Amino acid sequence: MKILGISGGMRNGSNDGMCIEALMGAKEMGAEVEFIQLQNLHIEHCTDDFDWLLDKMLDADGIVFSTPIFEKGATGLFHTITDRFGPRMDRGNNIIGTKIAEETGGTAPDPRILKDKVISFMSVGGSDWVTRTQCDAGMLALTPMWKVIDNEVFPWALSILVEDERVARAHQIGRNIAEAAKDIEHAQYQGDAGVCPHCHSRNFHLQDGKAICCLCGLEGEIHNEGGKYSFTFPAEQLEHAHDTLSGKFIHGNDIKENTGKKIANMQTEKYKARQAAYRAFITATVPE
Ligand SMILES: Cc1cc2nc3c(=O)[nH]c(=O)nc-3n(C[C@H](O)[C@H](O)[C@H](O)COP(=O)(O)O)c2cc1C
């Protein structure tokens, strides 16, 4: 079993340490380990070393990703990696694509891409402003439907490398990812049970008559049973959940239909006239 550790913090900072401590626990379980420090990489925003990074992640049986917390969420770079997983790693599209390829004599895309995989996350912050990072982390796994093992948040963690019990927790997380990768099929989630019984998320978008889980997108109802929160949903919503094949197939077909509508709409005179007036009204300002 091959475990990859990734750190999005500063070189030789706390995320590196927690990540490496997780790698140590993974080796204790018998894993070969590798470490990638993202500050050594050049990665552009979704409109360069990304393909290299992706190849490394695809060669790993399990992944431990440690990210700083920026504004109560993961770093911009973590969000960029998530943006850029979209067109290459979506499990629905990759199943569709290799099916069309096999049936039309096309070229079989990369086998590694559809391989099952386990991943764990650690979010390390300076304070208690930490309420969005675990959902950001889940977002990265959601696209390829990698199986999350741990998804841990460390608040008040500037001095975490002298906090022995919290370092021991990174070590255990590394043991977990290693065991999980031994038998990916029977690997089991080890994290907080959360509120969403399906997602494990604690993040919700709330409107009248509809509570939406911010990770998996199930639409249902939030209950306050004396301060304890719970989340229910009609079972049929499971077909639409954003982290299932069924939900991804639906989502992708909606994108295809709506993209087709747009291409045709771009031919209309209404579209062309409005666009021409935008171009004539103003020119974009750029730095000299
Ligand atoms: C721009 C910026 C925003 C940050 N926002 C938060 C935050 O919202 N909550 C929090 O706990 N820490 C925040 N921090 C502190 C970082 O999480 C902290 O510096 C990081 O975990 C250090 O890790 P490193 O040692 O690996 O680099 C922020 C830091 C920076 C630079």
Q: How many angstroms separate the CA atoms of 7 and 44, rounded?
A: 17
Q: How many angstroms separate the CA atoms of 281 and 285, rounded?
A: 13
**Length in residues, the chain:** 288
Number of domains observed in the structure of the chain: 3
Ligand 1 atom with least separation from CA of 10? 27
Q: Could you list the residue range(s) of the whole structural domain that residue 250 is in? A: 245-281
Q: Are residues 44 and 93 in the same domain?
A: yes
**Residue 190 domain flag:** no
CATH number of 65's domain: 3.40.50.360
**Residue 192 domain flag:** no
Structural tokens at position 109: 């895309």
Residue 7 phi/psi, 5-degree rounding, is -125, 130
Q: How many angstroms separate the CA atoms of 202 and 196, rounded?
A: 7
Closest CA to 138 of 60, 73, 71: 73
Q: Are residues 270 and 216 in the same domain?
A: no
Structural tokens at position 253: 């077909």
Whether 17 contacts 174, CB under 8 Å = no
Resolution in Å, one decimal place? 2.2
Ligand 1 atom with least separation from CA of 7? 26
Domain final position from 149, 182, 215: 182
**Residue 13 domain flag:** yes
CA separation (Å) from 159 to 14, 40, 164, 172? Answer: 8, 24, 11, 19
Q: Are residues 63 and 151 in the same domain?
A: yes
Ligand 1 centroid from CA 71, angstroms: 8
Q: Are residues 147 and 250 in the same domain?
A: no
In the three-class reduction of DSSP (H, G, I as helix; E, B as strand; rest coil), residue 149 is classed as: strand
Q: Are residues 210 and 67 in the same domain?
A: no
**Residue 30 domain flag:** yes
Residue nearest to atom 31 of ligand 1 (CA): 70
C-beta atoms surrounding 101 within 10 Å? 13
**Residue 286 domain flag:** no
Closest CA to 68 of 25, 107, 11, 22: 11
Pocket (CB within 6 angstroms of ligand 1) = 9-10, 13-16, 68-72, 124-127, 129-130, 155
Q: Are residues 217 and 132 in the same domain?
A: no
Residue nearest to atom 4 of ligand 1 (CA): 70
Q: Are residues 231 and 249 in the same domain?
A: no
Q: How many angstroms separate the CA atoms of 191 and 200, rounded?
A: 8
Q: After which residues is the chain broken (C to N over 2.5 A)?
A: 47
**Residue 189 domain flag:** no
Q: Are residues 174 and 265 in the same domain?
A: no
For a pocket test of ligand 1, which of 10, 67, 71 has the largest count of ligand atoms closer than 8 A to its C-beta?
71
- The maximal CA–CA distance of the chain, rounded, in angstroms, is 67
What is the dihedral angle through the alpha carbons of 77, 180, 88, 238, rounded to the nearest 10 degrees?
Answer: -100
Residue nearest to atom 15 of ligand 1 (CA): 126
Ligand 1 centroid from CA 148, angstroms: 23
Solved with: X-ray
Q: Are residues 22 and 75 in the same domain?
A: yes
Residue 114 phi/psi, 5-degree rounding, is -90, -5
Closest CA to 145 of 184, 108, 183: 184
Q: At what angle do helices 164-182 and 14-28 cross, to 10 degrees?
A: 50
The DSSP call for residue 46 is: P
Q: Are residues 136 and 24 in the same domain?
A: yes
What is the Cα 174 distance to its own chain's centre? 19
Ligand 1 atom with least separation from CA of 15? 26
Tokens 């204790």 belong to residue:
28
Q: How many angstroms separate the CA atoms of 36 and 41, rounded?
A: 9
Q: Are residues 138 and 171 in the same domain?
A: yes
H helices of 115-182, in order, are: 133-142, 164-182
H helices of 206-268, in order, are: 245-265
Structural tokens at position 137: 């982390």
Angle at 149 (CA atoms; ends 11, 9), nearest 5 degrees? 10
Q: Are residues 50 and 176 in the same domain?
A: yes
Ligand 1 atom with least separation from CA of 155? 11
Q: How many angstroms separate the CA atoms of 221 and 217, rounded?
A: 12
Q: How many angstroms separate the CA atoms of 113 and 90, rounded?
A: 9
Residue nearest to atom 20 of ligand 1 (CA): 68
**Residue 197 domain flag:** no
Ligand 1 atom with least separation from CA of 17? 26
